[PDB]
Every structure is written in C-alpha cells, then in structure tokens.
Design a protein around this ligand. Structure first.
Ligand SMILES: [Mg+2]
Ligand SMILES: [Mg+2]
Ligand SMILES: [Mg+2]
Ligand SMILES: [Mg+2]
Ligand SMILES: [Mg+2]
Ligand SMILES: [Mg+2]
Ligand code: NA
Lengths: 114, 177, 79, 152, 66
RNA sequence: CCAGGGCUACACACGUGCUACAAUGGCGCAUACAAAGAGAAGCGACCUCGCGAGAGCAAGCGGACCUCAUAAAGUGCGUCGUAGUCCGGAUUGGAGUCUGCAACUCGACUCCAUGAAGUCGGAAUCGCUAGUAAUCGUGGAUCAGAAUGCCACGGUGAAUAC
RNA sequence: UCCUCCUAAAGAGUAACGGAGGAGCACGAAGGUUGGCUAAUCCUGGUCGGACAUCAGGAGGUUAGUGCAAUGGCAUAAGCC
C-alpha cells in the first residue's frame, strides 16, 4: 500500500482505496484496475506485491498529486495575470461562473461578516 | 576519502595550471564545513531545540553544540544565555564524507532543482547555502520529522578571493548556473 | 462551449482586421463587437471594445486567443 | 477556588458506551450479571451503591483495564477517555518534579506556558513547580489529576 | 571524537536506481535505494523540457478544424 | 430607429423552496406494476457512430394504431460495518454537445478531476383528520434554447382526535 | 547617619537651605586556587529571519564588562568558562 503520494487505506477495496490519489476518482480507478488484470473487489492488504509494482506505472500514465496541483495553479494564476473576467472574480473571491451573489455564494465567500 | 584524494590527485594540478601558481600549497583548499540553524522558536518549546539537535546528529555524525544568545535583544523577546541555535563543525575525513554525500545525493533530491547561485560568496572565497528543508537528506525517513526546519551550510576555504573559491568549488562538480 | 465547428465572429471586424494587419500598429480600433473571438492575426494589436458607455483600449497579448473580445471589458463598476 | 475547566478535543455524536452484558466476578457469584445500557452522549449516570458492591470494578471493566468474564462493551471510534482512578498511586512515582509530571502530558504545547499556567490556574507557584511529584498531599494529587485531564 | 556521545557511523552501500554503486559512510542502520545521483540527474537534459508551460495559438489551431 | 450594456450587480437582512446530514441507506446486477397529456417551420421509432450529452440515416403519425415513453419507490442477490464514510454535492480546472445571427457579461446538458458546509438545527414558528400527511416518479403550458417554480396525474401509504 | 563627583584655588583638609546621584544590601558561590578564553559596534554571504536571534569571513580594537550610584582601576586581566 504505497503509491505516488501515499496509499494509506488498507482494509479497503482496491477500487475505492485508489481514490486517495489526487487525480483518480471512481471511473479512473476502474480504468486503472481493469488494465491491472485484477478484480475490483479485492482488498489492498490481500493482493500480492507483484501487482503494486504494475500499478505504479499504470498510475504514472496520468497526472497525479505532486504535479497536478502545480498544473491547476498555473491555470488559475494565468487568468489572474491575464486579466480575464474569470481572473477578476478569482482575485476578489467571488463566483466565477456567473451565479447569484445577492443572497447565496457563501461557499465561495465564507462565513458571514457583519 | 574519495573526494579528498580526488582533490589531491586532480584539483591541485587543474587549479595550478589554471592560475599559474608557483607553490604546491598556493592552491585554495577547503578547511571546514559549518552546519547550523537558529531555531528561534526555542523560547517556549525547549524540546524543539533537542529535536533539531537530533536532526543534525542524524545528518552529520557529531553531537551538535547548542548556541545561546550572545546579547539580549528586546525585538525577539530573548535575553542572554537562552539556547537559540545548534551548530556542528566538520573538519577532515568527516568533512570530506559529508561533502561527498551532500552534492552527490542530497542536492539532487531537492524539489524542482535548478542550480546553486555563483554570486553567493562573501568576497573571500567562502560559500554559504540554505537547504530550506531537512527532509532531503538521506539520513531522514520523511516520517520521523515534524517540521520544515532547514540548515545553513557554510563552506570555509583558504581561498584568497571569491574568484578562487568559485574555481575550487567548480573543480568539484558543483551544480552552479 | 459554443459549437464543434465554425468559430463565430463578426464580419465587420474581420474585414477591419485585414486592413489593420497590412498597415501594422496604428490608432486603436473602436469596435462594439464583444461576441467575436480573437484570431492569431490580431496579436499585438490595440483593439478597443465596448463596456456599455465607453471604449477601453485593450492590448491583445499572446495568451488571449481563445477568449472573446468582450472578455476583457468589465461592464459594471463596483466600489 | 482552583479554576478548572474541561474542554473537548473531538465531539462524538451518535452514542458512546453501548454495553450489553458484563457478568464480572472475582471470588463470589458475579457482582452483576447483565448491565445492558447505552450512553447517547448524556451526562453522568452517577453509579452508586454501598461499600463493597463493585462500582469501582464496574468502572474498571468499562475502562478496559479489567475484562469481563464474557461480554462486549465497545466505545465509539472517536472516543477519548480520561480516567481518574479511585486509588492513584501507580501515577505519582518515578520521582519527577511537578513541572516534569505536568509536562509529560500535553499534545502540542510550549514548555513554558500552557503547561506552566494550567499549574498556576490551580494553586501552584514557582516555589512549588519544583518540588517532587511523589510528595504532594491528597487534594494536591487530586488537583494534579484534574490538570492532566484538562490537558488531555 | 569524544567517546560515545555521538551516534554510530559506518559504511553503507548507497547505489542508484541505475547502477551507480557508491559506498558512503553514514548513520542510518540500513542500506538504502534512492533516485539518480547528480551523475544521472536530469539537470542538463531538461533545461528546455522544464521551460515548456505555455502555448495557446498552437492548441487553438488544432481546434480550427474548419 | 439602431448598436452595446442593465434588469443577473453584493460588507448584509427577510419570505417561499430544493438537496442533504445516512444503514427501514448508498452502490452494482437482474426483474415487475400505472394514470394523465402533448405532437406538422411538430413528436420523430429501428439501425449505425460516440463512454455520454448527442450526430448520420430515418419509416410512422395532424393520432385508442405512430412517437414522446425506460415510470421510480419495489422485489431477490452481493458489498459497504458508523467513518465526515462507497453519505453529501457545493465550488473550481480541463475537455465537449445542441438549440440560436450570436453563449464574455449571462443558457442548458455530458465526461475527467477536485470534492467544501453539513453528523438533525436557539428564542420562535408552519402544514395535515384518510387514500389525507409523508414519500416516489410522470406530463403540460409559456418555450428556438432556458426551472429546484406553477398547473395536473398516478404508485406506496400511516399515527392521533380523553 | 554613611558612600561618589564638582565648588576645593595641581599635597591633606575646607562652608552655605550650593549643583548632581545612591545605602540600611547580595553571595555557601558571586570566596580560595589551578587550567583556559577575550568584548561593543559595524560590513558583506546565508532557510524560515525582518533594521536587529543563530552561522562564516573582514574591519574595529575595549568605544564592551564589572551583583547595585559615581570616581579611580582593570589584558599579567580585577571581565568570561
Ligand atoms: Mg428581476
Ligand atoms: Mg585637594
Ligand atoms: Mg591647594
Ligand atoms: Mg566578584
Ligand atoms: Mg587565572
Ligand atoms: Mg575572581
Ligand atoms: Na470504588
């Protein structure tokens, strides 16, 4: 149980244990496991170490924790420097896809401040 | 050791023909390596200084000396005698071993490494460098550590100028710019 | 976001670009077209768009290609 | 008046105790047989009886240093248990100062405050934070236990 | 040295993942396997591979299927 | 009369709602049962392509025949074993689909990833007496496109009223 | 009542309701001896770290220090282990 960042979850199914990687969800985990030749119902601590090595390269053909964060930060920092409308909303801390800020948008704003 | 006899056999000749000296010992030689950090946050958590001392003992095979504040300064609310930092001086065989094991493995393990600056000399052939984090060193298992404490490496050579210090350090395959 | 084929712009600005590219950099173009995307034959220009009441001269840099002309003309003043 | 205040590290929600059957015994017929009960994050349930019934051994079974003859107790996966024993002599030993005893606890706290401050909030001074732990008397030992609970 | 105040010190084989056997004294207690050393570090080979974050006209052109 | 913008602005407050905080539940597999209504510059099977929104071809129907249109809770099998979790779905990055001259302001929907607050809610306050409350789905108008709203239909189906 | 400087006129002393500050202690080591060491403050280089923490070189040199006010003294240190 050791993948790019960390595969902390033992005692869990390999399909959901792989979700701990920043960049793999549910379908990607199924895509990873299907090409690994192992069933989706096997527990991480039960599968042999002859498949974890075959998983690290299968995880490696995607974008994952260490470098995915940098990639998306470059995308946001681009718009901030670009001066786009999304950049202005990203700089202020408001919704960027054009929804209500009259009453909603507490998720993007945070707790109220009188 | 390996870096020491590499220096003896090759660097002496290289620098001698480079600078057109006249004596065997006119070539600059590195005389010591100092590794320190002033933890600063030992005002209230004296165990932090012990943890840093253990980190330095693991990194280099010596027991660190605990350095105390020389003069009371009211800006950082410290006074005389407060243990503030830790320091280790390496000379000879241990200095050469650490010199090998730093620039062969520890520097490559730097996240997004690009190169050490060449204008970081104090004007007398001395070099200084900040590793910014203690996790890169192979003596650390990335899980025992608890903080982001970093060292301050200082290479003290007998060079008479920053030019000769640059030449000596570039003779040892330093990753400059 | 728009359609699979045919990136949509306005003719009156497309023809105005072809006159500007030959003459090079000049006085800014006062165009009301906001719904027109940017093409590589406009990089480095000084086109001006409408925010509702006045024209703001924008400088088309390298990265502003897929975006639209109105994407850099905020239309409401806040604080 | 010693200012003592018990905080909460992590708040558990559903229920805590949920014990089914203990039937603990030492020499005679078990002092109790079933004692099936729930907690529901309530308050107290002040166990009581007469001298020699076995309330202390019931608490020992609940806290787990003594296990029943056959049964299940279990706690919530987020449950953090502070324990103030009826007799506490296994604690005040090994010849530590008051400061050292009170500092052997604590999760992430500065050595000079938040541990020398919890001592002063309960009737202690500089002339007392250096006397040995194994010499305080009665109520002072109890107050030290309260302090360890406040920090845990 | 000063007679057992220090940690231990011994020779440990520290080879790369691409060969590169390097016997270095250290204080770990176990042989270790790590990434490339500066001998095979990707520093002089990715000088332009690292400076590649960019490109919008090129990815707009491929979108211009018409 | 025309183009562009606004009605969509946000330190905040109130009213009406939707989705939840889970285990009489999520998820995967297989299998049942409805009512009502609309459709001609409109509903558009079947087949092929696409993981999917959808695209190509395209009969039938201005209709008890043809399309919308697979109803969903349910039932049986397995797993998850009370964790901020295989609950939750906000927000954000990337890639797209279709109406439309035109999607930045400011559409809907699909895919990959991220995946927050929330673990039954203070003073106070609202609805309901039977096929009702609760709960699950379906359709229509306005409509090029654009509802968690409005109007309407059925499935399951209570407790209590001294 | 006691201590330090000036008035006090280059030996000592010298008054005023003349000009300025302190004391009624501390220490079982802050005493004895042996061995060892030299400060303030500025420059550059350096991870958090900033004008100022700690590290390395340079200048400077006693401008630091002396349990406590001032005067005299102190490197052979009377200063620091
Ligand atoms: Mg309105
Ligand atoms: Mg005289
Ligand atoms: Mg005289
Ligand atoms: Mg003395
Ligand atoms: Mg002496
Ligand atoms: Mg003396
Ligand atoms: Na008892």
């Amino acid at each position: 149980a050791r993948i790019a960042g960390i595969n902390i979850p033992d005692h869990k199914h390999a399909v959901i244990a792989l979700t701990s990687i920043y960049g793999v969800g549910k379908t990607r985990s199924k895509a990873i496991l299907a090409a690994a030749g192992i069933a989706e119902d096997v527990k991480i601590s039960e599968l042999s170490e002859g498949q974890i090595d075959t998983l690290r390269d299968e995880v490696a053909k995607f974008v994952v924790e260490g470098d995915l964060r940098r990639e998306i930060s470059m995308s946001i920092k681009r718009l901030m420097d670009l001066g786009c409308y999304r950049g202005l909303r990203h700089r202020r801390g408001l919704p960027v896809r054009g929804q209500r800020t009259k009453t909603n948008a507490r998720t993007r704003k945070g707790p109220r401040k009188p | 050791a390996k870096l020491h006899d590499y220096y003896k056999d090759e660097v002496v000749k290289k620098l001698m023909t480079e600078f057109n000296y006249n004596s065997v010992m006119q070539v600059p030689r590195v005389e010591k390596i100092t590794l320190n950090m002033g933890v600063g946050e030992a005002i209230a958590d004296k165990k932090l200084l012990d943890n840093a001392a253990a980190d330095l003992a693991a990194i280099s095979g010596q027991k660190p000396l605990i350095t105390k504040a020389r003069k009371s300064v009211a800006g950082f609310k410290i006074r005389q005698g407060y243990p503030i930092g830790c320091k280790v001086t390496l000379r000879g065989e241990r200095m050469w071993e650490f010199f090998e094991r730093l620039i062969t493995i520890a520097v490559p393990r730097i996240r997004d490494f690009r190169g050490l600056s060449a204008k970081s000399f104090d004007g007398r052939g001395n070099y200084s460098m900040g590793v910014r984090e203690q996790i890169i060193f192979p003596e650390i298992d990335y899980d025992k550590v608890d903080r982001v404490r970093g060292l301050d490496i200082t290479i003290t050579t007998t060079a008479k100028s920053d030019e000769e210090g640059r030449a000596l350090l570039a003779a040892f395959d330093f990753p400059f710019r | 976001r728009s359609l699979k084929k045919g990136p949509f712009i306005d003719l009156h600005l497309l023809k105005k670009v072809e006159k500007a590219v030959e003459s090079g950099d000049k006085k800014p173009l006062r165009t009301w077209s906001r719904r027109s995307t940017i093409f590589p034959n406009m990089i480095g220009l000084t086109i001006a768009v409408h925010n509702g009441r006045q024209h703001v001269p924008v400088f088309v840099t390298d990265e502003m290609v897929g975006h639209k002309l109105g994407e850099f003309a905020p239309t409401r003043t806040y604080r | 008046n010693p200012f003592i205040r018990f905080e909460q590290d992590k708040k558990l929600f559903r229920n805590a105790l949920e014990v089914e059957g203990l039937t603990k015994g030492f020499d005679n017929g078990p002092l109790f047989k079933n004692l099936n009960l729930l907690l529901e994050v309530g308050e107290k349930l002040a166990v009581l009886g007469t001298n020699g019934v076995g309330k202390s051994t019931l608490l020992k079974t609940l806290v787990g240093d003594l296990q029943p003859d056959s049964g299940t107790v279990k706690w919530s996966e987020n449950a953090r248990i502070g324990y103030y024993a009826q007799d506490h002599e296994y604690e005040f030993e090994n010849d530590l100062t008051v400061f050292e005893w009170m500092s052997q606890w604590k999760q992430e706290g500065d050595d000079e405050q938040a541990v020398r401050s919890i001592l002063g909030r309960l009737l202690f001074s500089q002339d007392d934070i250096k006397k040995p732990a194994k010499v305080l008397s009665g109520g002072e030992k109890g107050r030290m236990l309260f302090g360890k609970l406040m920090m845990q | 040295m000063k007679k057992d105040i220090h940690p231990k010190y011994e020779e440990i084989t520290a080879s790369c993942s691409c060969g590169n056997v390097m016997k270095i004294r250290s204080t770990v207690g176990h042989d270790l396997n790590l990434d490339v050393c500066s001998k095979c570090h990707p520093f002089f080979t990715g000088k332009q591979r690292d400076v590649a974050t960019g490109g919008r006209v090129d990815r707009f052109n491929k979108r211009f299927n018409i």
